[PDB]
Structure 1
Amino acid sequence: LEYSELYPIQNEYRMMQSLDGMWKFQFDPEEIGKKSGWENGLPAPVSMPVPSSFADFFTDHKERDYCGDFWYETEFYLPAEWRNKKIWLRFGSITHRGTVYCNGMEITSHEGGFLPVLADISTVAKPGQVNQVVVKINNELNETSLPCGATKILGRKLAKPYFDFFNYSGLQRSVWVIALPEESVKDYSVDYELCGTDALVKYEVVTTGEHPVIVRLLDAEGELVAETEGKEGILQVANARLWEVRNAYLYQIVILITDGNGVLDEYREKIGIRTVRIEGTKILLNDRPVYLKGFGKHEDFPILGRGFHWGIVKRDFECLKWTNANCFRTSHYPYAEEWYQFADEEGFLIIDEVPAVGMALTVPELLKSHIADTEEMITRDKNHPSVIAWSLFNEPETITDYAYEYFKEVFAAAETYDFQSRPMTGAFEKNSKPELCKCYPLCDFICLNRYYGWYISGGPEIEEAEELFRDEMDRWKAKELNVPFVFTEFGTDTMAGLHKLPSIMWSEEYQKEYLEMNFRVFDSYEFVQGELAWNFADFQTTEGIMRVDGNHKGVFTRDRQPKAAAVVFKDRWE
């Protein structure tokens, strides 16, 4: 990559300053901003919180549903001391695609709305002065970038997703301006081997120069436990304190660039010594089988939309721990980096998912976008101990040799980017029948999204649903694939407060009964090794006749309170 994905830190060599706050903001329905000098400042802005999705602040439909080009602007004072450092704007994300300007100059553009955007403003930055950043953003959906959809023209544009979740957009994550030394740590990778009571931390370091590198490992108390020299090497850890499920331990890696007797740069990050591998039908963490228990989530909260906030992280993890979960999938896009940092702390397992949802010649361009997002996700997230698997798709077509050749390239790219070569998978929709699917052989383990008892034979037909479920799982069993299966979606829309005896679809009681039936099926097959329910919480969707204020398959409400079924998960996962 032409930039670093490394999370920004502050020390003797690296500086950072937050640009979060109220930005200037303006819609550009006529698409004349770049024609009209907007990159030098917006002509008639309103204020817009950053980080946040813009949609749910407004009281009018056309602003909430805005689709097209729209602009952000802010000003920041740059400390004079940042002079002659490499100065970067770092956006947690820009959703979905955008062009960054600084002091009237075009800096960079990015496609993909859920991963960091880095813009090198070294040559245009004005140390000791007020600087200006302007971002042109677009939130349309197409079939050549992720996530896929269409754009309808009423000249007013309307996003038409091929995915369920609401098309939130804007500057949904924190924005920093940072300063790095001229020769810096750009990237590093760690991989682990367990040796009795000891451990090896294998590493590679990429810098922007040719000076020597020293790598140190500190324990949780900051004590030096290992040290070595070189951009490539092994850190030997005696009596290693392994990072364990729901029982984290984090070391601190310290990467130094040196020039004789002085340090040029120093990067530090918390990491966790752990191994993950698929062995037969088992998922092994540190050589012991683990059964995944948890949820698909979303970045979704009232008013903020996908806007990041530590308070949402904290509540969600307390709820997760209360259910006795150990895992979540980042459905259906990489989350803010902070979610992974916290999962590292709390010992949660993550399946990290690229926004390959909603899946013509456009396909070669789509593949490029999909591979680019995969590269960025893996480079960003590989050193989190929590991240134990990559999900490279959600419910694509998989039953043609055409689909096979496409995903072969994606998986091949993912493999080259992940230093750890940790398990890769994808979530299969029901149409990927065991007799037809061509893509499951690409996977280290198989993830199934199934709604037997909701979309199939729901309600009075739920007994039929269970037989149909068992019939499919019997077909999978007969294949003797010798791989683990994880259910990554299953659930029922459930309106909090809707009670019925006997239960009906949409009642709290039916949600319980549906889950109990699914558990019976899960527990009937030895090779099922994980259950991640859909969804952790009710979340916003495109409005329509099938969505009663978003998706109500949450086990929790949108404001994070338990429906009756939450207790069912709690008791089972205990």
Structure 2
Amino acid sequence: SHMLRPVETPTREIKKLDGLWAFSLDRENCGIDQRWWESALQESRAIAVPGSFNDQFADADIRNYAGNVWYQREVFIPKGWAGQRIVLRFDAVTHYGKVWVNNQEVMEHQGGYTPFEADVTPYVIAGKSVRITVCVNNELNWQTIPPGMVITDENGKKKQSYFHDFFNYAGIHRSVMLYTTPNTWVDDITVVTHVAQDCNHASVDWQVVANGDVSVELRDADQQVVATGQGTSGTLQVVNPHLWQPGEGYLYELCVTAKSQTECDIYPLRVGIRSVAVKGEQFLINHKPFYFTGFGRHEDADLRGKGFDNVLMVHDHALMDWIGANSYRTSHYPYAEEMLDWADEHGIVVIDETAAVGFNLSLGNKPKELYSEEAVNGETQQAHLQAIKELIARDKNHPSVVMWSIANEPDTRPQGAREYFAPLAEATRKLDPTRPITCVNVMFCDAHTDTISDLFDVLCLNRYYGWYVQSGDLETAEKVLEKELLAWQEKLHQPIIITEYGVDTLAGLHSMYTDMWSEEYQCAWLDMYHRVFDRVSAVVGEQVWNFADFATSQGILRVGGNKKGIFTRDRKPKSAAFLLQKRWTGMNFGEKPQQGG
């Protein structure tokens, strides 16, 4: 549906994410039958929100738990809020969430990484305190995004199984708020910014105002007006100077007011004026070839799981800024909007990515046909499209987002793969014509076996695990890698971005033999990649797999949540960090190095 970011502009909200809530594990799955949303959570404990619930209690059984959990908290509504259209919103409840304000069900949602909101005006009163109960579910199946298989042992004890790398953290990972708008105008905007030769150009506007006449005002960083538009929707105004550039990200403000006969609603929307477009093998930002550098990240840290935190965010950006990263990719799920906001203001280019990982049973009682009624089916497809919808509906206006990534590492060999993704690709294009589309490719689906990449605009290649198959031989790895890249170039003639490349590296482990798992190896490995990159013209970006060590699912090729990061989980740097700092900062900003110079 319509998705705007709650901001304060004679519009108001009251953070509810003071994180101290009542928490309970519904081991027996009685909570719903016994209407737990009606009375206080029995035998509950204090938990923090935003935050995963898995690691807050240093308890393995809570961490590995699967099924239903219950969040509960009481809150006063601002009295001033009398007849003001009150809506309760959850920025993200990971996987499933159902909400009751005092015995009244108002909400249900399936995605773990996108916001949902409901009008609660008629269930609440200006001066009163209400009970808010949330039922959260962390179970994945073939119709969820991302997919999974719960395994129920003989004892009926649930056990989540999934096909992606990162740990399946759950809970309210993000801000939950209560906000206010005039009864006149609610919930949607859409913007498009065109550019010619960096001489002037226009900004296509269009939005719904929920029964109000809208006027539009484009304002400067100086807060001065530069263009006007009454056109309720379909406003088009030409501008004369300041483009949104990766280095700086100059931002304009679009003021959308909605005039009723009596009520007024004002919404400020930040605008970056830039064109994103593929031309041949180049990826153009304002008609300039751009070269990506940066990371595949992960919403992950020490006690908070995937819970959002302002400190982490400021620190990690200071690292990326130091290291010379000009970009990153929201690896395997949509990030907190505050992340994209930051990017917008600082000119960080982003590859916005759905939660669609684990469409692959070929990465080590599993179904033999990946695309089958039993496994990834029409309903799954429908869930996927829905995931694509809500992400786009949330992020279509961020200048930082230069590209949509529909899925990560699907197995595209089997029959049914192209039957599954062709419709998806088409849909996302119609949903947003402004941005190039992509689907991150697995290694074993190489140029000669892959059956989907032609349906997309830019080639994103995950080449992590080149050290697995090449058994840690650099000489061999460099020859094979250069072979495959050129093959991909001749096949698609698209821009190529390496979206994953790196090696598990144990911090502190040093070796004179420069062998696997040593800081020295991570350097040699990365360096071998960079050398071939500078030799291949179609390569327009390089994103190291993992900014920082994150927790992973249980396994043998797994070392304490694994060590794929350039930085540790506590954000300390391994040797490779300085190697990258040197390559990225010695580089002309956003310019691809000539054949290694």
TM-score range, shorter chain: over 0.9
Match of 1:413 in 2: 427
Aligned to 1:439: 452
1:176 deviates by: 0.2
Q: Does 1:52 align with 2:51?
A: yes
Three-state SS of the structure 2 residue aligned to 1:374 is: helix
Partner letter of residue 70 of structure 1?
V
**Helix, strand or coil at the partner of 1:200:** strand
Q: Partner residue of 1:199? A: 201
> What SS class does the counterpart of residue 121 from structure 2 fall into?
coil
Partner of 1:326: 326
- 2 CA distance for matches of 1:163 and 1:417? 27
Residue type at the aligned position of 1:303: L
Shift in Å at residue 400 of structure 1? 4.1
Could you report, residue by residue, the CA deviation over 1:352-382 in whole angstroms, capped at 9, with x for unpaired residues?
0000000031511111111111100001011
CA distance in 2, matches of 1:167, 1:452: 22
Paired position in structure 1 for 2:241: 240
Instruction: Give the secondary-structure state (helix, strand or coil) at the position aligned to 1:298.
Output: coil
Counterpart-to-counterpart distance in 1, 2:272 and 2:431: 19
* 1:532 and 2:534 aligned: no
Partner of residue 500, structure 1: 511
Q: Secondary structure at the match of 2:385?
A: helix
What is the CA distance between 1:119 and its match in structure 2? Answer: 2.4
Contact 2:214 2:259 in 1 (8 A): yes
Distance 1:352 1:478 in 2: 27
Q: Structure 1 stretches (4+) deviating beyond 6 angstroms?
A: none
Q: Tell me the SS of whatever aligns to 1:553.
A: coil
Pairing partner for 1:364 from 378, 387, 392: 378
Tell me if the contact between 1:334 and 1:377 (Cα under 8 Å) persists in the aligned partners. Answer: yes
CA distance in 1, matches of 2:469, 2:530: 17
1:401 Cα offset (Å): 4.9
Whether the 8 Å contact between 1:98 and 1:136 is mirrored in structure 2 is yes
Query: Secondary structure at the residue paired with 1:50?
Result: coil
SS in 1 for 2:577: helix
Q: Deviations over 1:234-254 (max 9, x none)?
A: 443433211101211111111
DSSP 3-state at the match of 1:214: strand
Q: Kindly, what percent of the aligned residue pairs are identical? A: 40
Q: Does 1:304 align with 2:304?
A: yes
The answer on whether the counterparts of 1:427 and 1:448 sit within 8 Å (CA) in structure 2 is: yes
Q: Distance in 2 between matches of 1:263 and 1:458?
A: 68
TM-superposed CA distance for 1:183, in Å, is: 2.2
Q: Are the counterparts in 2 of residues 201 and 236 from structure 1 also a CA contact under 8 Å?
A: yes
Aligned residue for 1:478? 490
Rounded Cα–Cα distance in structure 1 between residues aligned with 2:118 and 2:260: 27
1:547 aligns to 2:558 (yes or no):
yes
Residue type matched to 1:162 in 2?
A: F
User: Counterparts of 1:526 and 1:218 in 2: how far apart (Å)?
Assistant: 40
* Aligned counterpart, 2:73: 74
Q: Counterparts of 2:51 and 2:545 in 1: how far apart (Å)?
A: 24
Whether the aligned pair in 1 keeps the contact of 2:547 and 2:565 (CA below 8 Å) is: yes
* Partner in structure 2 of residue 254 of structure 1: 255
Task: Confirm or deny that 1:396 pairs with 2:410.
Answer: yes
**In 1, distance between residues paired with 2:17 and 2:122?**
20
Q: Aligned with 2:499: secondary structure?
A: strand
SS in structure 2 of the partner of residue 486 of structure 1 = strand
Cα distance in 2 for residues equivalent to 1:263 and 1:485: 51
Q: Deviations over 1:22-70 (max 9, x none)?
A: 0111110111101112011312211110000011112321111111101
**Which residues of structure 2 form unaligned runs of 5+?**
360-371, 586-597
Alignment of 1:6-25 (within 5 A): 6-25=4-23
- Residues 303-346 of structure 1: CA deviation (Å, up to 9, x unaligned): 11111111111111111111111110000100111000001111
Aligned match of 2:400: 386
Amino acid at match of 2:401: V
In the TM superposition, residue 263 of structure 1 has moved relative to its aligned partner by 5.2
- The one-letter code sitting in structure 1 at the alignment partner of 2:426 is A
Partner of 1:562: 573
Secondary structure in structure 2 of the residue aligned to 1:157: coil
**Whole-angstrom distance in 1 between the partners of 2:414 and 2:283:** 29
Deviates more, 1:88-97 or 1:154-163: 154-163
Q: Among residues 28, 34, 37, which one is paired with 1:36 in the alignment? A: 34
| Cα contact 2:549–2:569 (8 A) shared by 1 | yes
Please tell me the residue identity of whatever aligns with 1:424.
I
Q: Which moved more, 1:10-19 or 1:528-537?
A: 10-19
Q: Classify the secondary structure of the residue corresponding to 1:189.
A: strand
Q: CA deviation at 1:432?
A: 1.6
Give, in whole Å, the separation in 2 of the partners of 1:421 and 1:551. Answer: 37
RMSD over aligned Cα atoms: 1.5
Please name the residue that 2:355 is paired with: 355
- Greater mean alpha carbon deviation, residues 182-191 or residues 20-29: 182-191
SS at structure 2 position matched to 1:216: strand
**384-393 vs 141-150, which moves further:** 141-150
Q: Which residue of 2 aligns with 1:93?
A: 92
- Corresponding residue number in structure 1 for 2:438: 425
- Aligned equivalents of 2:170 and 2:247: distance in 1? 33
CA distance in 2, matches of 1:293, 1:237: 32
Q: Secondary structure at the match of 2:194?
A: strand
1:313 match: secondary structure: helix
1:233 positional shift: 3.1
Show the counterpart of 1:522. 533
- Select the structure that is richer in strand: 1
